[PDB]
Amino acid sequence: GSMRDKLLDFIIELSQSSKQVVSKSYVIDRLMQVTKEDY
């Protein structure tokens, strides 16, 4: 659902960039946003 859509949007964000390497800290930050829940 929502998490999967957020994951796909992050994949699109990576795919649309011309960069060949990306900041690891940025990837981690974004994935923590993708997985964030409310408890």
Residues 5-24: x where in contact with a second copy by CB under 8 A, - otherwise, as a string: --xx-xx--xx-x-xxxxxx
Instruction: Measure the CA–CA gap between 31 and 16, rounded to whole angstroms.
Output: 17
Asked if residue 32 lies in contact with residue 6, where contact means CB atoms within 8 angstroms, the answer is: no
Q: Which residue type occupies 19?
A: K
The least CB distance from residue 5 to a second copy, in Å, is 9
Grouping H, G, I as helix, E, B as strand and the rest as coil, residue 19 is: coil
Q: How many residues bind a second copy (CB under 8 A)?
A: 23
Residues that bind a second copy (CB under 8 A): 3-4, 7-8, 10-11, 14-15, 17, 19-25, 27-28, 31-32, 34-35, 37
